[PDB]
Design a protein around this ligand. Structure first.
Ligand SMILES: Cc1oc(=O)c2c(c1C)O[C@]1(C)[C@H](O)[C@@H]3O[C@](O)(CC[C@H](C)[C@H]1C2)C(C)(C)C3=O
Ligand SMILES: Cc1oc(=O)c2c(c1C)O[C@]1(C)[C@H](O)[C@@H]3O[C@](O)(CC[C@H](C)[C@H]1C2)C(C)(C)C3=O
Ligand SMILES: [Cl-]
Ligand SMILES: [Cl-]
Ligand SMILES: [Cl-]
Ligand SMILES: [Cl-]
Lengths: 147, 147
């Protein structure tokens, strides 16, 4: 494909970044793209108590969160100064990210580490691990419940 | 050096891992080793409100934290399953870590991401960035306040 004609470093970055572009242009029609069938989302740290999720579990969560909290105009950007960290050998890419969205209750805007793992070919995501701001996310969860 | 004869990947992992070995064997006479003079520790996420610190600032903080909470027997290990993520071109290593210590009040045991950046030679750390468990670390700070 056109992905395979790119150098591996570049391919890994494009594949990993796609996760964010997908979130920004998300619709029910197309859903979550550029993931392997068996891809797993892991939410770090363990203390946060979010189990690993399949693509289908992720899609269900995101539809509901967006409805419940009237969220839209998602935008993701790298923390100023940060860079993509790419381990070609291990098919991994590490980003230091901000995610922003408008919602009924104001704005969602949190900071994250994401660790993406691709398939051997560097063309799809097989794992995404995101380390979240536990204090911030526990507050969002409490705003969402009964709200 | 012996370090310079090692392939760069291995050099980077050794220089990044040294940070945790230094933490385990920490003492007043030897201090913090394996860092550039101008090395900075960054604590993420920004919401946690901890400023960047110099080697001197880190050393003083650790002395204090160990005294105040009577902490000892530190151990660091990679989260089971995780691996070191090495970006040779950018001189970076990413670890998914647990840190454990005995203290008066029981046990400190938290989960992190560390992003280590070396000098161009890969022999010294010039930046350490650690993404912490904000709920957990808030508690620990609250417990450290008069107790
Ligand atoms: C495709 C997509 O659509 C969405 O609508 C949202 C998505 C994604 C990836 O991710 C975030 C931004 C968030 O990164 C992720 O989800 C959370 O449940 C929090 C809810 C937020 C609002 C959620 C929204 C987690 C704490 C585990 C977390 O970090
Ligand atoms: C050499 C060394 O000696 C020490 O005594 C400790 C050290 C190190 C590296 O690191 C930790 C384990 C911790 O990773 C770090 O410092 C904290 O302020 C909390 C206190 C803990 C106990 C602290 C103790 C932070 C919230 C920013 C944090 O993550
Ligand atoms: Cl997802
Ligand atoms: Cl070092
Ligand atoms: Cl330190
Ligand atoms: Cl770093």
């Amino acid at each position: 494909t056109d992905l395979m004609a790119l150098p591996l470093r570049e391919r890994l970055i494009q594949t990993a970044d796609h996760y964010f572009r997908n979130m920004e242009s998300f619709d029910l029609e197309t859903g979550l793209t550029g993931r392997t069938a068996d891809c797993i989302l892991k939410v770090l740290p363990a203390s946060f108590g979010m189990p690993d999720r399949t693509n289908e579990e992720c899609m269900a969560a995101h539809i509901a969160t967006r409805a419940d909290m009237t969220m839209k105009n998602f935008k993701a950007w790298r923390v100023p100064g940060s860079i993509p960290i790419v381990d070609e050998a291990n098919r991994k890419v590490v980003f230091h990210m901000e995610i922003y969205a408008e919602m009924g209750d104001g704005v969602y805007h949190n900071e994250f580490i994401f660790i993406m793992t691709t398939n051997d070919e560097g063309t799809l995501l097989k794992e995404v691990a995101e380390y979240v701001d536990t204090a911030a996310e526990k507050k969002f969860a409490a705003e969402r419940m009964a709200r």
